[PDB]
Amino acid sequence: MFKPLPITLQRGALRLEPLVEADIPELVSLAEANREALQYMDGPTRPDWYRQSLAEQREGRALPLAVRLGVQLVGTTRFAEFLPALPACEIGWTWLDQAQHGSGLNRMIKYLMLKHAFDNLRMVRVQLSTAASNLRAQGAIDKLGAQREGVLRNHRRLAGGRLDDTFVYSITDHEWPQVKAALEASFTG
Amino acid sequence: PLPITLQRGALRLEPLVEADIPELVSLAEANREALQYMDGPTRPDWYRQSLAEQREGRALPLAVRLGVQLVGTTRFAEFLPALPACEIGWTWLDQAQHGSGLNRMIKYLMLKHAFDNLRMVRVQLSTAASNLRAQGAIDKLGAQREGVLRNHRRLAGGRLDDTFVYSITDHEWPQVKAALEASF
């Protein structure tokens, strides 16, 4: 019996709050201005993508989050692919407005969600995955301390519809205390 | 995903229906011993769960018949419609078919349907890291190990275990098909 509940996470001006329908126009618009950075995820420029993340939430298959800095929307991320009997999930489907590319915002987001996943939901496993072609995301997930677990062939389509492989990484609950220590050792006080 | 009938001589795979569940549960209870894991074949809700996913477009569970006789079940699940891709698994057969090769011909029929009818680019298979038997059967299919997912499943007694994930791409399918055919 695992049922995910809505969560807001904060640190300073950074707030992760449950995605609602009233956010979709602004997020779609911001994603479109970030079209070229989104070449490795197919969906964030279409309104349907956010409606389907809300549908999955309605069946308790996801907790999609809007990312705000102060008042302004800045992007999205989600917990998803719940394995309720473990419990396990996946974190990803993240994008940020290019004004935040390289400020440690992405790493702070993964930290907040990882901590919530392991410390509060007692996940035994958090999966992270990305396109085989998305080298930047592979390096950021490695620096998280996740371990690559495999490469799934012909497993996703990029923005043009080209077939790509998927790199799959995970953190287990027993290694999380070490991962957590190293992540918080990396944050500016 | 849509209902469908796959056949090969006496072997027939057809969509699972609620009316088959009593006989399948009963037949698995006669094979209780031979089912360490999985958890499922003795539980009617395990079958109804798969029927429910089918109404949501997420699984295609099949009754396995030899002639008119129900001998087991198997399914397609984990659909990725944009690729398209899926997983085949959740197979069990009563012990009269143990070591008879029916398992591999079932996989042959299912893999044919996924690649040659549905034109999938990826068929996934997986098993517990502790299930050495199922690993050897998957190897002999020619499926290539792709990943080891840690803490990815609970075994029948509840303990955490890793999952070995394998796949067959569409380009490997010709050779997989020929090697399956040669072994019949």
Instruction: Find chain B residues with C-beta within 8 A of A149's C-beta.
Output: 147-150
CB contact under 8 A, A86 and B148: no
Number of Cβ within 10 Å of residue B44's Cβ equals 12
Please, are residues A126 and A118 in contact by the beta-carbon 8 Å criterion? yes
Whether the CB of B147 is below 8 Å from some CB of chain A: the reply is yes
B133 annotated ligand binder: yes
Q: Is A84 on the interface with B (CB under 8 A)?
A: no
Q: Do the Cβ atoms of B92 and B64 come closer than 8 Å?
A: no
| DSSP character at residue A101 | T
Give me Rg for the CA atoms of chain A: 16
Contacts of A124 in chain B (CB under 8 A): 151, 160
A167 vs B126: CA distance, rounded Å: 17
Beta bridge partners of B155: none
State this model's resolution in angstroms.
2.2
DSSP chain B: -----EEETTEEEEE--GGGHHHHHHHHHHTTTT-SS-SSTT-HHHHHHHHHHHHTTSEEEEEEEETTEEEEEEEEEEEETTTTEEEEEEEEE-GGGTTSSHHHHHHHHHHHIIIIIS--SEEEEEEETT-HHHHHHHHHHTPEEEEEEEEEEE-TTS-EEEEEEEEEETTTHHHHHHHHHHT-
For residues A157 and A188, give the distance between their C-alpha atoms in angstroms, rounded to a whole number. 37
Whether the CB-CB separation of A94 and A106 falls below 8 Å is answered with yes
User: Are the Cβ atoms of B82 and A150 closer than 8 angstroms?
Assistant: no
B154 touches chain A (CB under 8 A): yes
HSE-CB at A166 with a 13 A cutoff on CA atoms is 21
DSSP-derived 3-state class of residue A113: helix
Total count of domains within chain A:
1
Distances A146 to A45, A122, A167, B76 between C-alpha atoms, Å: 28, 17, 12, 30
CA–CA gap between residue B163 and residue B154 (Å, rounded): 10
Place of tokens 């197979």: B91
What DSSP designation does A99 have? G
Separation between Cα atoms, residue A87 and residue A73, nearest integer Å: 30
Interchain contact, A155 vs B80, CB within 8 Å: yes
Ligand-binding annotation for A172, yes or no, is no
Going A45 to A49 to A51 to A57, the CA torsion angle's sign is negative
Question: Could you tell me the two tokens for A24?
Answer: 């979709």
Nearest chain B residue to A124 by CA distance is: B151
| Angle in degrees, 0-180, between the axes of helices A24-33 and A47-58, rounded to the nearest 10 | 130
Pairing assessment for the beta strands B85-93 and B122-128 based on DSSP bridges: parallel
Alpha-carbon gap: B149 to the closest alpha carbon of chain A (Å)? 6
Say if B118 is an interface residue toward chain A (CB within 8 Å): no
Question: What angle (nearest 5°) sits at the alpha carbon of residue A55, between those of residues A152 and A43?
Answer: 50
Check: CB of residue A73 under 8 Å from CB of residue A58.
no
Please list, residue by residue across A73-91, b when 16 or more beta carbons sit within 10 angstroms of its beta carbon and e when fewer do: bbbbbbbbebbeebbbbbb
**Inter-chain residue contact A154 with B121, CB threshold 8 Å:** yes
DSSP codes of every residue in A5-64: ----EEETTEEEEE--GGGHHHHHHHHHHTTGGGTTSSSTTSHHHHHHHHHHHHTTSEEE
CB-nearest partner of B122 from A124, A127, A155: A155
Confirm or reject contact between B151 and chain A (CB < 8 A). Answer: yes
Distance CA A131, CA B79 (A): 18
- The phi-psi region of residue A7 (left if phi > 0; otherwise alpha if psi is between -120 and 50; otherwise beta) is beta
- Contact of B121 with chain A, judged by CB distance below 8 Å, is answered with yes
* Residues of the domain holding B183: 1-184
- By CB atoms closer than 10 A (0-12, 13-18, 19+), residue B18 is exposed
Q: What angle do CA B66, B67, B71 make, to 5 degrees?
A: 30
Distance from C-alpha of B102 to C-alpha of B110, rounded to nearest angstrom: 12
A149 touches chain B (CB under 8 A): yes
Which chain A residue has its CA at the smallest distance from B166's CA? A152
Given a contact cutoff of 8 angstroms between Cβ atoms, the answer to whether A76 and A44 are in contact is yes
Place of tokens 């396109």: A131
Q: Which residues contact A78 (CB under 8 A, 6 or more apart)?
A: A19, A53, A62, A63, A64, A65, A91, A92, A93, A94
Spatial CB neighbours of A55, under 8 Å, sequence gap ≥ 6: none
Which of B154, B165, B170 is the closest to A85 by Cβ?
A: B154
Q: Which residues of B touch A152 (CB under 8 A)?
A: 122, 124, 146-147, 165, 167
Q: Which residue does chain A place closest to B86, by CA atoms?
A: A155
Taken as a whole, chain B contains a residue count of: 184
Instruction: Name the strand (E) or helix (H) holding A92.
Output: strand A88-96
Spatial contact of B15 and B63, defined as CB atoms under 8 Å apart: yes
Q: Is B177 annotated as a binding residue?
A: no
Confirm if B161 and B130 have CB atoms less than 8 A apart: yes
